Point group: C4
Chain length 32, copies 4
């Protein structure tokens, strides 16, 4: 149930870091 | 619980703006 | 509540089309 | 309800593989 959905949403937290970091992978291929 | 999941989904709202804006970062590296 | 979370997850459906289509924006900047 | 939300979140699992694989599409356009 409810708490163990909340603790899936706080995984989908991890995937929305890994969104950020692996876009910021691409920006720094495109970079400094 | 339920309402404070809904108010996580409306964070995952924020990450799916930041999807958009930081793709639209890349499109404008690739741009005008 | 429950049904109106389900009908947020089936928005986050829409954002995970717009993931796809606006990556496939970038692939076709990078293209045919 | 609850279990069939959990089994939507474990689809949004599939979309956050397809995030990964179709970014890693772009990295290997940009590549080896």
């Amino acid at each position: 149930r409810m708490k163990x959905i909340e603790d899936k949403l706080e995984e989908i937290x991890s995937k929305x870091y890994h969104x950020e970091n692996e876009l910021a992978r691409i920006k720094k291929l495109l970079x400094e």
